[PDB]
Structure formats: structure tokens, C-alpha cells
Amino acid sequence: NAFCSQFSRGVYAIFGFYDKKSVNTITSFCGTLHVSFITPSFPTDGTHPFVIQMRPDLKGALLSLIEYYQWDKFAYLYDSDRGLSTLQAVLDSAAEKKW
Amino acid sequence: NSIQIGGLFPRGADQEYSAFRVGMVQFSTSEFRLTPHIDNLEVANSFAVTNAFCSQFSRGVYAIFGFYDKKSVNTITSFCGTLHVSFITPSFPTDGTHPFVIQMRPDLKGALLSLIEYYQWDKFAYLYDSDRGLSTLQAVLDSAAEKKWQVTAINVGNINNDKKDETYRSLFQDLELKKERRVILDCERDKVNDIVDQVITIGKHVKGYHYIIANLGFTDGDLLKIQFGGAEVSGFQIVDYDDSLVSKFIERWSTLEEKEYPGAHTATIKYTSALTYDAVQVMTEAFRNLRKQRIEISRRGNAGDCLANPAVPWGQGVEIERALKQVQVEGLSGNIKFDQNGKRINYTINIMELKTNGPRKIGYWSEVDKMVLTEDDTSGLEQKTVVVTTILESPYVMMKKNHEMLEGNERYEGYCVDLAAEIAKHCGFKYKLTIVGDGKYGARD
Amino acid sequence: VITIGKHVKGYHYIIANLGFTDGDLLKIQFGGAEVSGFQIVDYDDSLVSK
Ligand SMILES: *[C@@H]1O[C@H](CO)[C@@H](O)[C@H](O)[C@H]1NC(C)=O
């Protein structure tokens, strides 16, 4: 509702936050209707046009710090709210590097 | 009476569209009829699903039949929960308690876990795809901590089409370095057929390997090529062809016309199309029951657009969802009974195995009676227990001091007892020691 | 050979004809079994390559 009401107003760009539930709604609407979306939320997995992510990635920083401390056995506690893309990185790297 | 409903079908759902039309003709009654109003869309696009829902809300529908995906499950359950329109689907079950949504697919996570403790696995691999949600992966990872497993989970879904053969072969070589003999496949029918073909080419269907295909359709895929290889394959199925109600349907299904009904002239049906056929029965049974208790659901007032501020419910929709959940019939899947949330309860899943003759049946799974084997196997008569006779003389055969506590071969000790153990090892048999009854070595009267 | 699983490591095959690469050879290539053979036509030769 709030996307289409501001689209009727004739706005140039939209600044907002999204969750894991509404990430698919934003990237589909802005891709079709060709409006830019600037967000400080978590980056989307894959590539989507017309979306500007302001938050840097973190998957490279974890795999460096774990390797620096030289860990082989640990426990990973996660919350599902930002997606499961971080868990999929540390499960695929675990099989390659024997964790 | 004519009841007007809606339909949302994906691009290329040819067999499910055919089983929808066959279910219309057979479950038609002279008392009332159903109007389909079928639309076609891209299921992954949330924009296209939003236009399709608000269009059929403008015409005015009593219920909506459709499919969804992971990328659009949240669009469906939010619209149906707010605007009070019921939704019947054969897709994957949602996580939580969403109102106004009827799931026609049985759950799988309880059956998959119980099969693993039956084969008694401690270490295995798990290949998954991200399309149906990660609910099955989160089930086995949480259960691995409390019951002491070692699970290797690899994402196989995002492989590009052009570079398939390099990526699958690099994958199994990494599993070979870990000496992973046990693999679980959680993929759809097209993705399983691609992995199975890459298994054979590099030579991984030989004796010593085991595979579990974690979907409700076991025999829907190609199965002849791994049949003669030598590796055991287990799986699950909800459709029983030996049942008379299913076998009557297959006889009508094979004799249909290809040019009118595409995909009809086959010997088998998919589990997706079977639940599409059953859903027409559930929708017809509800409005037949709803007219029988004299409840009027006529809505002469116009709906308007879906984007109404404030959004208003219509109280006849509360009556309809209670009628849909209170439906108990018999179908191709089996007994169809619903709980309060709308998920199927009181169902059976058939555990199957692949043999050189073909797929067989070794039991079933139910939520009250966890795993029940089917006693159709007689074995053990091939092995012989050789009867060894002896006499009690020291130090050849002697009774141990705790002979009351022990039983059988453990009771005796001596020279001949150790000699009997050595000969059975070199010859390769099993034995049972018996004292001679007469107590004499041997003579002839 | 492939269907019953006899192209794995530990097996050897000799194809006794003058045409080795004329038949289909990609399917036993990645398996693991050694295959030997004979050929009289040399594609590296300039007269053949012309
Ligand atoms: C399911 O319930 C019905 C009665 O409501 C019963 O006849 C049937 O046997 C039940 N299913 C199983 C597998 O016991």
C-alpha cells in the first residue's frame, strides 16, 4: 500500500527498510516500475537492479577471523531474520576446509 | 446453483491442469456446479501474483485454488489472512499457523528422521535445494545435536546450466575425500534426474553406496538405470497403485486423449497432480455440505478494489473456511482429515526400497504408530545351525562354575570346546553344543 | 558394461580393431578403467589433416 501511494504522488526515489518477509515485494516492484530504492538494510542474495544497499557485506570478515584464530570445532547460533545466507557460507566453507 | 471459484496456475503445469479438468467431470453433481475462471502466471514474481489476486477479488470469488513458491508465500498468506478469502493449495506446507490457507500436501520431516534411525546412521551427507524452503535442513541440523550425528550439508541449487558437469564432478570428489558413503537427496524430480546421471558417469552406483531420495514421489523419476547397478536406494510414496480406488482411476487415466488432455496417456501420475485431483473433491464436498445445513453465502454487494482503506472483511468468508476444514473424504492420497490450522492429519506414507525386480514396499509411517514394518519376508532358513554332539569328560569338556547364569555355548569349557571354535572359523559355520543323552561313546548291541 | 557397473578402477580393456577413436569413447573416459587400442590413421600428420 505505501509503495503505490507514494508512486501516485510522483516521487523520484524511495528510502526505506525491508525485512525478510518483504524483501521479495520491494525488489520485484522497483525492478518492474524502474524506481530507485536506497536502503540501510541487509544486502540481498544475488543481484537485483534499482536497489542501492548501504550496508557492507560481512561473510568475508567472518571467514578471515575464524581462520586467524585457527578454529576447527565451534558452535554457531543464528537468528533467521536476515535470511540464511550467512549460514550457507559457513557450511560450504566448512566442508572445504574441514570444520 | 452455480458456485464461482478462481484458479491460479503456473506456466507449464500441463499434467496438473489435465487432472483438474478430469476431477471436474467425475465429481460433477446435478445439484450444483463449479466455475473455474482459470488464470496463468509466473509464480516467482510477486508483482504478477498481486495483480492476479486483486483481479479475481474484483469479480467476486468464494474460494481460490493455486500454487505458490518460496518467493511469493508471504504475499499469499498476508492477503488471504486480511481479506478473509480461503486458499487451497498442493504446494509445500507453511511454517507456523497461518489462517485461511489449506495445505493438501502431507508433511515429510517426521518420516525422514525416523527412516534414518532405522538404518542406524551416524555420519552422512545431505544435498539440498533452496526452492521448497529450508525447513527440512533445519529439522535434521537441530536433531543432529541431541542424537549425536555428523551432517555435511551442501547447497546444490544455484548451479548454472552451462557449467553443470564440472560442478557436480568437483562435488562428489570432495565427498570422496571424506569417504562419505551415505547421501540424502532433497530435490525435485528434474534435479534428482540430473544428479543421478552424474552419479553413474563417474561410477558411483556400485555396491557399498546408499541413497535416500527425500520427496513424496519415488517412482515418478527415472529408476531403471540405477536398478541393476548395485547400490541401495530408499524412498517415500503416498500414492498406492495396489489400491482399488487408485487402480480404477489409472484405467480411466490411460485411455484419455492426448490432443485434448496433454500428459494423460501414461501409466503413472505425479503426486502433485494427484493432490490436484483430490482438491476438487474437497471443494465439491464443502459446498454440498454447506447447502445441506441451509447456510446462505450469497453476496449481492460489490467487493470493490482490493486496496481498500480501511480494509473490511466479509463475514460469509468465516463460514466458508469452517466448512472447508470440516471435510473428510477418501481420495488417491488416502484419508483426508484436517486440524484447526489446516494441515493434514491422520495420513500414511509408504516406505519403499529399490530392488532388481523393481520398487517394493517394506512398511508405512503414521504419526500415532511411528514406524510399522510389513511382515512379508521369510529369511534365516538359509543359514544352518550345525548340531555338535559331545560327551562330558575332563579336561575335554567341562562345565563352568556359573553355568546357571550363562546359557548355551557359554556354559561349557575345555579342550574340545576350543577345538570346536577353531574348526568353525576355518570352515565357516555356526554351531550349537549338545551333550549326548546316553552318556556313552558308542557300541553296537 | 556401464549399466551393471564395470567401468570402475581395477579393470582393463583392449579393443582389438584398427579403429580406436571411431567408436563412442566419452562415457568410459571419466569412469576409472584403463582402455588401450590401435590406430593406423594419424590425424597429426599434415597429409591427413589436409
Ligand atoms: C483416520 O480416521 C478415520 C475415522 O475418522 C479412521 O477410519 C481411519 O482408520 C484413520 N486412519 C488410520 C490410518 O487409522
DSSP string for B308-332: -SS----THHHHHHHHHHS--EE-S
Distance B285 CA to ligand 1 centre (A): 18
Find, among B175, B247, B248, B241, the residue nearest to B211 by Cα.
Answer: B175
Paired with B66 in beta bridges are B8
Residue type for position B147: K
Chain A positions touching B75 (Cβ under 8 A) are 24-25
Check whether the bond before B310 is cis (ω within 30° of 0): yes
Residue B421 CB contacts under 8 Å (≥ 6 apart), including other chains: none
A29 to B45: CB separation less than 8 angstroms, yes or no: no
Minimum Cα–Cα distance from B169: chain C residue? C30
Contact A90, B157 (CB under 8 A): no
Minimum Cα–Cα distance from B180: chain A residue? A95
Please report which helix (H) or strand (E) contains residue B336, including its range.
Answer: strand B335-338
Substitution site in B240, B333, B335 for ligand 1 pocket (most atoms within 8 Å of beta carbon): B335
Query: What cell was used for B412?
Result: 561349557
User: Over the Cα atoms of chain B, what is R_g?
Assistant: 30
Interface test with A, best of B41, B46, B79 (most A CBs within 10 A): B46
Chain C positions touching B228 (Cβ under 8 A) are 3-4
CA distances, B251 to each of A58, B244, B248, B432 (Å): 58, 11, 5, 56
Q: What is the largest CA-CA distance in chain C?
A: 42
Contact B102, B342 (CB under 8 A): yes
Minimum Cα–Cα distance from B48: chain A residue? A28
Sheet harboring A36-39: ordered strands across?
A13-15, A36-39, A51-53
Residues across chain B: 445
Q: Rounded to whole angstroms, how far apart are CA atoms A16 and B420?
A: 84
C3 to B202: CB separation less than 8 angstroms, yes or no: no
> In 3-state terms, what secondary structure has residue B105?
coil
Cβ–ligand 1 contact at B335 (below 6 Å): yes
Residue B144 CB contacts under 8 Å (≥ 6 apart), including other chains: B150, B151
- For residue B141, with 0-12 CB atoms within 10 Å meaning exposed, 13-18 middle and 19 or more buried, which class applies? middle
B154 to A88: CB separation less than 8 angstroms, yes or no: no
Mark B301-323 as b/e (b = at least 16 C-beta within 10 Å).
eebeebeeeeeeeeeebeebbeb
Chain B positions touching A88 (Cβ under 8 A) are 155
Sheet harboring B335-338: ordered strands across?
B329-330, B335-338, B344-345
Q: How far is CA B92 from the centre of its chain?
A: 12
Q: Tell me the pairing of strands B359-365 and B349-354.
A: antiparallel
B153 to A91: CB separation less than 8 angstroms, yes or no: yes
> In 3-state terms, what secondary structure has residue B78?
helix
DSSP letter at B390? E
Atom of ligand 1 nearest to the CA of B348: 13
Residue B430 CB contacts under 8 Å (≥ 6 apart), including other chains: B383, B384, B385, B386, B424
DSSP letter at B389? E
Return phi, psi of residue B136, to 5°.
Answer: -80, -35
> In 3-state terms, what secondary structure has residue B423?
helix
Contact C38, C18 (CB under 8 A): yes
User: Over the Cα atoms of chain A, what is R_g?
Assistant: 17
C30 to B169: CB separation less than 8 angstroms, yes or no: yes
C30 to B228: CB separation less than 8 angstroms, yes or no: no
Check whether the bond before B395 is cis (ω within 30° of 0): yes
Pairs of residues, one from chain B and one from chain C, whose beta carbons lie less than 8 Å apart: 26
Contact B279, B86 (CB under 8 A): no
Signed CA dihedral, B250, B252, B257, B261: sign only: negative
Chain B positions touching A4 (Cβ under 8 A) are 307
Give counts: helices (H), strands (E), chain A: 4, 3
Gaps after which residues in chain A, C–N over 2.5 Å?
Answer: none
Query: What cell was used for B433?
Result: 553344543
CA distance A28 to chain B (A): 6
Cβ–ligand 1 contact at B46 (below 6 Å): no
Q: How far is CA C50 from the centre of its chain?
A: 24
Cβ–ligand 1 contact at B346 (below 6 Å): yes
Minimum Cα–Cα distance from C33: chain B residue? B203
Binding partners of C (≥3 Cβ pairs within 8 A):
B
Paired with B203 in beta bridges are none
Minimum Cα–Cα distance from A91: chain B residue? B153
Residue C15: other Cβ atoms inside 10 A: 12
Residue A37 CB contacts under 8 Å (≥ 6 apart), including other chains: A13, A14, A16, A26, A27, A30, A50, A51, A52
Query: What cell was used for A88?
Result: 550457507
The data reach a resolution, in angstroms, of 3.6
Contact A39, A28 (CB under 8 A): no
Chain B positions touching C27 (Cβ under 8 A) are 201
Q: What is the largest CA-CA distance in chain A?
A: 55
Chain C residues touching chain B at CB-CB below 8 Å: 2-5, 7-9, 27, 30-32
Substitution site in B243, B346, B364 for ligand 1 pocket (most atoms within 8 Å of beta carbon): B346
Q: Rounded to whole angstroms, how far apart are CA atoms B329 and B277?
A: 13
Chain A positions touching B152 (Cβ under 8 A) are 95
Give counts: helices (H), strands (E), chain B: 11, 22
Please report which helix (H) or strand (E) contains residue B2, including its range.
Answer: strand B2-4
Q: Rounded to whole angstroms, how far apart are CA atoms A26 and A36?
A: 10
Atom of ligand 1 nearest to the CA of B366: 13
Contact B360, B369 (CB under 8 A): no
Q: Rounded to whole angstroms, how far apart are CA atoms A22 and B59?
A: 27
